[PDB]
Design a protein around this ligand. Sequence first.
Ligand SMILES: Nc1ncnc2c1ncn2[C@@H]1O[C@H](COP(=O)(O)O)[C@@H](O)[C@H]1O
Length: 147
Amino acid sequence: SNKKMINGGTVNNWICINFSRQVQDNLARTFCQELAQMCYVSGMAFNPEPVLPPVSARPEQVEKVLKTRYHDATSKLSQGKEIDLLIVILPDNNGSLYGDLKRICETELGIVSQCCLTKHVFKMSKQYMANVALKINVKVGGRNTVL
Ligand SMILES: Nc1ncnc2c1ncn2[C@@H]1O[C@H](COP(=O)(O)O)[C@@H](O)[C@H]1O
């Protein structure tokens, strides 16, 4: 048996930020749509549409992009509702970007984040998507089986 979801969590509001210059807006959109679909059919409640469309940014502006997009997306929500997930597309080799991203999301924004490498965005295999869905589920409070 492969791992599966026991309890699916809920992602009603999410956004995507892209840091890869190899990824156009539409590919970020398509990738997120496939991931959202996998999360759903695996047992999550998962909004097929993001709060805002994907934005592309330079790694050098990680702090400003995250804080700005967080603000803009949150302000679009019904009062008191919050962003459940940030999906980040990252270059395969990204140096300090991953750690900067995680520090900002964990300790300043308080937002769950899921990083996805460019190599997987181009491939977009079902097995990858299923694995990432499992990771997202745990992060938002769901529960998965053990092997
Ligand atoms: N510096 C890094 N440390 C760990 N994982 C990384 C790093 N840069 C990119 N990744 C990718 O981050 C993915 C998981 O992201 P996340 O669950 O949000 O921690 C893995 O598939 C890694 O290949």
